[PDB]
Design an enzyme around this catalytic site. Sequence first.
Site, PDB file in Angstrom:
ATOM      1  N   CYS A  65      24.142  13.604 -51.415  1.00  0.00           N
ATOM      2  CA  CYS A  65      24.618  14.981 -51.517  1.00  0.00           C
ATOM      3  C   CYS A  65      24.968  15.574 -50.161  1.00  0.00           C
ATOM      4  O   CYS A  65      24.156  15.566 -49.233  1.00  0.00           O
ATOM      5  CB  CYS A  65      23.609  15.883 -52.225  1.00  0.00           C
ATOM      6  N   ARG A  68      23.465  19.780 -49.276  1.00  0.00           N
ATOM      7  CA  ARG A  68      22.022  20.006 -49.222  1.00  0.00           C
ATOM      8  C   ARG A  68      21.562  21.143 -48.303  1.00  0.00           C
ATOM      9  O   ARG A  68      20.357  21.382 -48.177  1.00  0.00           O
ATOM     10  CB  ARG A  68      21.301  18.712 -48.831  1.00  0.00           C
ATOM     11  N   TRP A 237      28.175  23.867 -57.096  1.00  0.00           N
ATOM     12  CA  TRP A 237      29.599  24.105 -57.313  1.00  0.00           C
ATOM     13  C   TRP A 237      30.375  22.865 -56.903  1.00  0.00           C
ATOM     14  O   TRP A 237      29.826  21.958 -56.273  1.00  0.00           O
ATOM     15  CB  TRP A 237      30.104  25.343 -56.562  1.00  0.00           C
ATOM     16  N   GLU A 242      36.260  16.243 -55.485  1.00  0.00           N
ATOM     17  CA  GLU A 242      35.726  15.642 -56.704  1.00  0.00           C
ATOM     18  C   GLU A 242      36.720  15.768 -57.856  1.00  0.00           C
ATOM     19  O   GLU A 242      36.796  14.899 -58.720  1.00  0.00           O
ATOM     20  CB  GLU A 242      34.400  16.296 -57.098  1.00  0.00           C
TER      21      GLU A 242
HETATM   22  C1  HEM Z   1      25.729  23.490 -54.160  1.00  0.00           C
HETATM   23  C2  HEM Z   1      26.806  22.707 -54.255  1.00  0.00           C
HETATM   24  C3  HEM Z   1      26.776  21.224 -54.191  1.00  0.00           C
HETATM   25  C4  HEM Z   1      27.786  20.439 -53.728  1.00  0.00           C
HETATM   26  C5  HEM Z   1      29.104  20.932 -53.196  1.00  0.00           C
HETATM   27  C6  HEM Z   1      27.367  19.081 -53.839  1.00  0.00           C
HETATM   28  C7  HEM Z   1      28.182  18.021 -53.448  1.00  0.00           C
HETATM   29  C8  HEM Z   1      27.875  16.740 -53.845  1.00  0.00           C
HETATM   30  C9  HEM Z   1      28.827  15.711 -53.944  1.00  0.00           C
HETATM   31  C10 HEM Z   1      30.293  15.814 -53.626  1.00  0.00           C
HETATM   32  C11 HEM Z   1      28.195  14.599 -54.369  1.00  0.00           C
HETATM   33  C12 HEM Z   1      28.853  13.264 -54.603  1.00  0.00           C
HETATM   34  C13 HEM Z   1      29.277  13.177 -56.074  1.00  0.00           C
HETATM   35  C14 HEM Z   1      30.175  11.992 -56.324  1.00  0.00           C
HETATM   36  O1  HEM Z   1      30.791  11.459 -55.375  1.00  0.00           O
HETATM   37  O2  HEM Z   1      30.317  11.548 -57.487  1.00  0.00           O
HETATM   38  C15 HEM Z   1      26.837  14.931 -54.545  1.00  0.00           C
HETATM   39  C16 HEM Z   1      25.913  14.019 -54.975  1.00  0.00           C
HETATM   40  C17 HEM Z   1      24.684  14.463 -55.415  1.00  0.00           C
HETATM   41  N1  HEM Z   1      24.201  15.716 -55.425  1.00  0.00           N
HETATM   42 FE1  HEM Z   1      24.989  17.281 -54.741  1.00  0.00          FE
HETATM   43  N2  HEM Z   1      26.142  19.016 -54.381  1.00  0.00           N
HETATM   44  C18 HEM Z   1      25.700  20.276 -54.598  1.00  0.00           C
HETATM   45  C19 HEM Z   1      24.487  20.713 -55.142  1.00  0.00           C
HETATM   46  C20 HEM Z   1      23.508  19.863 -55.637  1.00  0.00           C
HETATM   47  C21 HEM Z   1      22.382  20.238 -56.385  1.00  0.00           C
HETATM   48  C22 HEM Z   1      22.022  21.644 -56.793  1.00  0.00           C
HETATM   49  C23 HEM Z   1      21.661  19.085 -56.671  1.00  0.00           C
HETATM   50  C24 HEM Z   1      20.402  18.998 -57.443  1.00  0.00           C
HETATM   51  C25 HEM Z   1      19.330  19.749 -57.187  1.00  0.00           C
HETATM   52  C26 HEM Z   1      22.377  17.998 -56.089  1.00  0.00           C
HETATM   53  C27 HEM Z   1      22.019  16.673 -56.142  1.00  0.00           C
HETATM   54  C28 HEM Z   1      22.950  15.648 -55.930  1.00  0.00           C
HETATM   55  C29 HEM Z   1      22.639  14.265 -56.317  1.00  0.00           C
HETATM   56  C30 HEM Z   1      21.377  13.746 -56.953  1.00  0.00           C
HETATM   57  C31 HEM Z   1      23.711  13.534 -56.001  1.00  0.00           C
HETATM   58  C32 HEM Z   1      23.851  12.048 -56.202  1.00  0.00           C
HETATM   59  C33 HEM Z   1      24.491  11.711 -57.547  1.00  0.00           C
HETATM   60  C34 HEM Z   1      24.578  10.212 -57.678  1.00  0.00           C
HETATM   61  O3  HEM Z   1      23.683   9.489 -57.177  1.00  0.00           O
HETATM   62  O4  HEM Z   1      25.541   9.691 -58.288  1.00  0.00           O
HETATM   63  N3  HEM Z   1      23.482  18.513 -55.465  1.00  0.00           N
HETATM   64  N4  HEM Z   1      26.640  16.266 -54.234  1.00  0.00           N
HETATM   65  C1  XEB Z   2      30.376   7.670 -60.840  1.00  0.00           C
HETATM   66  N1  XEB Z   2      29.340   8.718 -60.879  1.00  0.00           N
HETATM   67  C2  XEB Z   2      28.076   8.155 -61.388  1.00  0.00           C
HETATM   68  C3  XEB Z   2      27.032   9.240 -61.555  1.00  0.00           C
HETATM   69  C4  XEB Z   2      27.156  10.451 -60.874  1.00  0.00           C
HETATM   70  C5  XEB Z   2      26.189  11.444 -61.030  1.00  0.00           C
HETATM   71  O1  XEB Z   2      26.281  12.647 -60.375  1.00  0.00           O
HETATM   72  C6  XEB Z   2      27.265  12.924 -59.380  1.00  0.00           C
HETATM   73  C7  XEB Z   2      26.962  14.331 -58.926  1.00  0.00           C
HETATM   74  C8  XEB Z   2      25.640  14.768 -58.910  1.00  0.00           C
HETATM   75  C9  XEB Z   2      25.330  16.063 -58.508  1.00  0.00           C
HETATM   76  C10 XEB Z   2      26.349  16.921 -58.112  1.00  0.00           C
HETATM   77  C11 XEB Z   2      26.052  18.216 -57.705  1.00  0.00           C
HETATM   78  C12 XEB Z   2      27.088  19.058 -57.317  1.00  0.00           C
HETATM   79  C13 XEB Z   2      28.397  18.585 -57.333  1.00  0.00           C
HETATM   80  N2  XEB Z   2      29.420  19.391 -56.952  1.00  0.00           N
HETATM   81  N3  XEB Z   2      28.660  17.320 -57.731  1.00  0.00           N
HETATM   82  C14 XEB Z   2      27.671  16.484 -58.121  1.00  0.00           C
HETATM   83  C15 XEB Z   2      27.981  15.189 -58.529  1.00  0.00           C
HETATM   84  C16 XEB Z   2      25.103  11.224 -61.870  1.00  0.00           C
HETATM   85  C17 XEB Z   2      24.979  10.021 -62.550  1.00  0.00           C
HETATM   86  C18 XEB Z   2      25.940   9.029 -62.389  1.00  0.00           C
HETATM   87 CL1  XEB Z   2      25.748   7.483 -63.282  1.00  0.00          CL
END
Ligand code: HEM
Ligand code: XEB
Lengths: 362, 362
Positions: A65, A68, A237, A242
Amino acid sequence: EEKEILWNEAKAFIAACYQELGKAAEVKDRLADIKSEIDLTGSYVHTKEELEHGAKMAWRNSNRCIGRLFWNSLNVIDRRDVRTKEEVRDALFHHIETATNNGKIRPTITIFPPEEKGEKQVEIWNHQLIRYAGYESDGERIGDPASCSLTAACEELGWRGERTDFDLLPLIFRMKGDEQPVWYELPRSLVIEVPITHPDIEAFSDLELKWYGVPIISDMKLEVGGIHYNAAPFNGWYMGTEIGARNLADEKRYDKLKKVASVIGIAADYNTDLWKDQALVELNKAVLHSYKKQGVSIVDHHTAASQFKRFEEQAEEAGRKLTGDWTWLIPPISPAATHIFHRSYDNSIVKPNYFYQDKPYE
Amino acid sequence: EEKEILWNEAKAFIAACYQELGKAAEVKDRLADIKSEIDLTGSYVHTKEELEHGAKMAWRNSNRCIGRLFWNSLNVIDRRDVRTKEEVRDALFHHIETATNNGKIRPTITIFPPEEKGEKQVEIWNHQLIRYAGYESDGERIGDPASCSLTAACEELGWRGERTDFDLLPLIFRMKGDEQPVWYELPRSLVIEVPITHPDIEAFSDLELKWYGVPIISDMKLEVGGIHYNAAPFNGWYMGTEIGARNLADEKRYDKLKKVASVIGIAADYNTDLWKDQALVELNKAVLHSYKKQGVSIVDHHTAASQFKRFEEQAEEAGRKLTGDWTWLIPPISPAATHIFHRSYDNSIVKPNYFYQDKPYE
Ligand code: HEM
Ligand SMILES: CNCc1cc(OCc2ccc3ccc(N)nc3c2)ccc1Cl
Ligand code: HEM
Ligand SMILES: CNCc1cc(OCc2ccc3ccc(N)nc3c2)ccc1Cl
Ligand SMILES: C[C@H](O)[C@H](O)[C@H]1CNc2nc(N)[nH]c(=O)c2N1
Ligand SMILES: C[C@H](O)[C@H](O)[C@H]1CNc2nc(N)[nH]c(=O)c2N1
Ligand SMILES: [Cl-]
Ligand SMILES: [Cl-]
């Protein structure tokens, strides 16, 4: 043999959590009770503050993320009391409503009862609470291919989509005790959608592109102090990339670049013209513009990277070890124009955190 | 204790090299001689074919190179016979001339005598045989900051640059026995430069950008069968992104994006306008166009990625284990539009290969 796994991660969590809240003295007599509770119940229950903080610490340790910086402003809704499908549905409805906040998106997480004996109290099938359906059958390719198998799984349950490219999937989840999940069609008034337009290319509206306002991940497992909140949908958001660089751009998703290249008046014939790269930029300009024009929260990858740099700075200051996944932190649009590209991160997994869990369908 | 390190990597190399050339029978009596030669001389000498192939195998195992499809067409110039500064200089001059080939760039490697007792026979100080100088002193910032310390090191040797933004650095290398390196100014007729112009934006020439035609890395160590060719400059052709997205774009290099945004008629005021991303594309379109307009070899990142996919395919077919560095394989422009982004690679180091070695200056 499980009560030593749960206990040793509860020792770690409470000690660290109370340390950050300034309640280090209260650690000893809270740990004692947990040891008692674990022994006599097989598990333990978090307080409002532990769960709230533990869910913020989980966001902070998400190596992938980029957003953060605002880990501490996370709005944590405690729904560990739900017992019925109607409560879960309404909790999910409310989450969508409060997180959307008329467009001024509020980072929110709704937390349902955790696994008991590994058994899920609730079992959410949606990848996101709001997502478009996908269909492929007999050379036909409608909607979002990412949602193909869930869609087919919903249509095995009495649901039927209109087979437009933007069918809202229904909420679908299964409760403990039941063999099959239930589904609920979403009230449209609860869902904000943004029609994609260009600031200076009027032909762009002919593509009839749109996306949903709020990204609410609902298939990941929150782990806080040895406890498994398998059902805890959260949202932030969107970062513009994305939507513009992946969801609408990928060949295995909406695959819009050639159509984009057409409406912006360039050829999609030669690689050396960099037509995909040019279409990606204009499409991504259109996405950010379209969201801000409607009043829905969104961030660009540059501003997001600046914020993430502040998060790094804030982390060193607090003597916090920083962890990140470089491959996921870099934006898919001009990654070399961000500081992220030019430095490395430690992809170490620190708990509390959010994890992948196995899908129930497919 | 070194003759067992050199011998065990010579066992591995010869066995594999002769296996690919179809000379597996000739392995046994070649290994024997090497064991003799190593014992009585402390080292061994490669044949024309071993060195030629070993240098192609080294290119093939470069995890960070996206252009490895043409690993077998590498032109290997054997200059292990050189003994004097004039021979080295002329070998370097010839390499530049033959690799450039009037613009139809020919992937070439010139190989000088390897280290004897770890002692370098030749010691090349240039990062590339053709590179621009860099100066920073008293708020002044001229040329390429990447070349700041080598430039200062050359100006300690009697050389002096004109302090334009594109001063050709001299060839500078040190021979075994000498305490200081010599330098030779490059004949301009041996160096092709490309003035960057836009296909449809005539104002772009006002930036007065240009780059050199041939990228010739000359500070890396070729290792083939336990033998260390510390001095073996090689070249390919440019991928457009190296010039347009890094060399001319990086803030710590030429930093041209705001100037690019100016000549293409857009504002560089707001992040949400994606002005850097738009400037990057137009600058990168200008680079490819400018090279092909002059008749100098260049590849775009899309075409390069297609070729690298063929390399992957060709590798599985030959039962070859593929290795790659994802972080270096993805282009800094629209990496998600290439297959590379959506798959993973094994960053394992297989020899023969090219390695970093410590700089002599700074
Ligand atoms: C506030 C705005 C936020 C933005 C702009 C943001 C942005 C991102 C982006 C761009 C990704 C990559 C997603 C992808 O490439 O598919 C990501 C991954 C992630 N975000 Fe955030 N995020 C935000 C808030 C949060 C929140 C609130 C949480 C949870 C408490 C969170 C937890 C995660 C997690 C767990 C991933 C990894 C997902 C995965 O492993 O596929 N994020 N974030
Ligand atoms: C290809 N993506 C796989 C995958 C993405 C996932 O989440 C992506 C993700 C997670 C959290 C987010 C929070 C904010 C945001 N703007 N995008 C976010 C995008 C969760 C599970 C899987 Cl399996
Ligand atoms: C034929 C055209 C070639 C192209 C288009 C090409 C492309 C590239 C690119 C873009 C990089 C990354 C450079 C960077 O990001 O700084 C790279 C790395 C590399 N290439 Fe190639 N390459 C080519 C030929 C060769 C040849 C002939 C060799 C040597 C035999 C070679 C060996 C390498 C090595 C060793 C690296 C890694 C450099 C490092 O570790 O910093 N390549 N290549
Ligand atoms: C930041 N770059 C560091 C570095 C790059 C080096 O080479 C990059 C490199 C190497 C080989 C190449 C071959 C062809 C090509 N077009 N670019 C190429 C680029 C060598 C040493 C160092 Cl220390
Ligand atoms: C730390 C990180 O690996 C570093 O900034 C890398 C990223 N990827 C790269 N990719 C290429 N092609 N060239 C580079 O110099 C780098 N730098
Ligand atoms: C194999 C590779 O890690 C994979 O394709 C990754 C690359 N980086 C990514 N980065 C983001 N943000 N999202 C992704 O889905 C991926 N996929
Ligand atoms: Cl999404
Ligand atoms: Cl370069």
